[PDB]
Design a protein around this ligand. Structure first.
Ligand code: 44K
Length: 264
């Protein structure tokens, strides 16, 4: 397609020089031409004994991507920022691990927000793992547990056309960013991510506060599709200390640990 001219490759050397060294917590960064799933790859490293804390894996293309709840993730080469990072979590109470996922979405949003000229309506965070812009899914986040680690995965649509991946998707290009630079965006993303991970590890109240400020879900009428197929309709009110969504259902509180949110 014509978007190929807007998709130059990543510069691995430059990313390493920016992100590895004094002042940074990232220990390793690799760019691979392609793989099945960056999340699976880092999980596999950990499963064979690797210390993956602060390890970054970026793929130009991903052929067997994973979404939440056994779903998939679609991509074409060089159209997204596709990455996974390792996070040691055993030092943090297990009940707080759900916030690491929310923190990642916040980091992704903050990394790309200033690139848009004028933010259209419905731009922000949808619980529990969506970055939305103009109602479209700009990025998806997947967290997978492999004690003592969590592997955090990010799929961010940079020039990816919705016709290539999913009808409800959007990208920076489709949001009016004419020539997005994936090298600059990747660096910004990883720096934002480091800060949010540190905040999460230290239970900094600003993490929850900043998330709330960018939430599209809180205050909205929602239908939540639960694991198992059930739907619950209510109004989202808050996120608890476990990262769970708190719903007002006719005056009753229903707290949801996992589900698919539709804003009504
Ligand atoms: N590229 C896409 N953009 C927007 N929506 C998409 C795209 N591809 C598929 N979709 C739809 C089709 C299935 C839906 C999956 N939604 S979900 O259940 O909330 N899961 C997610 O959003 C988590 C996605 C995480 C993908 C990252 S990419 C690198 C890392 N490795 C990996 O295999 N997964 C993560 C979204």
């Amino acid at each position: 397609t014509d978007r190929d001219r807007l998709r130059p490759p990543l510069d691995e050397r430059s990313l390493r020089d920016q992100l590895i060294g004094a002042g940074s917590g990232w220990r390793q960064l690799d760019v691979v031409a392609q793989t099945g799933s960056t999340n699976a790859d880092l999980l596999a490293r950990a499963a064979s004994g690797a210390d993956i804390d602060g390890v970054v894996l970026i793929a130009e293309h991903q052929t067997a991507g994973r979404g939440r709840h056994g779903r998939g993730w679609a991509a074409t080469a060089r159209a997204q920022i596709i990455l996974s990072v390792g996070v040691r979590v055993v030092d943090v109470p297990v009940q707080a691990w759900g916030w690491l996922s929310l923190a990642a979405g916040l980091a992704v949003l903050d990394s790309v927000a200033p690139l848009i000229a004028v933010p259209p309506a419905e731009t922000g965070l949808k619980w529990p793992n969506d970055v939305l812009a103009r109602g479209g899914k700009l990025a998806g986040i997947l967290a997978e547990v492999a004690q003592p680690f969590v592997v955090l995965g990010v799929g961010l649509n940079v020039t990816q056309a919705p016709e290539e991946v999913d009808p409800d998707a959007t990208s920076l290009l489709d949001l009016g960013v004419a020539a997005p630079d994936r090298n600059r965006i990747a660096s910004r993303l990883l720096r934002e991510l480091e800060a949010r991970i540190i905040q999460w590890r230290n239970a900094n109240p600003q993490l929850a506060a900043d998330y709330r400020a960018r939430s599209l879900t809180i205050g909205s009428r929602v239908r939540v599709e639960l694991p198992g197929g059930q739907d619950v309709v209510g109004i989202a009110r808050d996120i608890d200390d476990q990262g769970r969504l708190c719903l007002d259902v006719g005056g009753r509180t229903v707290v949801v640990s996992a589900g698919d949110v539709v804003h009504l």
